[PDB]
Amino acid sequence: IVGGTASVRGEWPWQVTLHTTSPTQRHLCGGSIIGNQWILTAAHCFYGVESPKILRVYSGILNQAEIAEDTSFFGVQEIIIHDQYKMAESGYDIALLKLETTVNYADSQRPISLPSKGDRNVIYTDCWVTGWGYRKLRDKIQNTLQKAKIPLVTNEECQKRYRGHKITHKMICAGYREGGKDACKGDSGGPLSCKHNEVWHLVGITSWGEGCAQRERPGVYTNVVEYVDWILEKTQA
Ligand SMILES: *[B@@]1(C2=[C][C]=C([C][N]C([N])=[N])[C]=[C]2)O[C][C]([C][O])O1
Secondary structure (H helix, E strand, C coil): EEEECCCCCCCCCCCEEEEECCCCCCEEEEEEEEEEEEEEEEEECCCCCCHHEEEEECCCCCCCCHHHCCCEEEEEEEEEECCCCCCCCHHHCCCCEEEEECCCCCEEHHHHHHHEEEEEEECCCCCEEEEEECCCCCCCCEEEEEEEEEEECHHHHHHCCCCCCCCCCEEECCCCCCCCCCCCCCCCCEEEEEECCCCCCEEEEEECCCCCCCCCCCCEEEEEHHHHHHHHHHHHC
């Protein structure tokens, strides 16, 4: 996260850190708890990943330092990538992780509600992007989960900032015209939480952008509301 600040412990209870154990353990992507056995994240996060066996999901984490060899984690039973996904910039950047075991909810780890189709007209004025990602295009994973408040931008506005790309309605952007605050490498798969009427909603999934926090280059996120039907289909046994 660029231009953000340290989050308060338990402030984003749905945020998880997804690690890969190959070659050695390290943070791979962010993700969001949306069900007792389900993590919603980004599809492009699994490039080069041929088995769920090397994945470890850690919930209730503030500092990466809390994760040690003796720290408990959730194994991944199955990685479900949207069948139309090809690459982040083309959309459909969404994936589900079916955990091997169930998450016991608590103040430190609980699910975030999905947006409803009846909230597309609603205007989110309190949105935040979070993660352990870079603080600059060239950096490294951060210890403390970072947070940054960022305004949503209309698709038409976003399309103007990405002439070489096609910003579809299945995408949603957020950023400041002057830049300064934005997601960055390592934040992928992270949630774009927005609080409306005292209730947090998972509005987007950190997907891509040109550089990080550059002027007139809004972050691009997967428009979650467009996948509630998909999520229901894939999570219902
Ligand atoms: B992701 C990833 C996160 C953020 C960016 C840049 N995004 C914005 N808005 N400037 C690119 C990639 O983090 C983990 C990595 C693994 O594929 O991708």
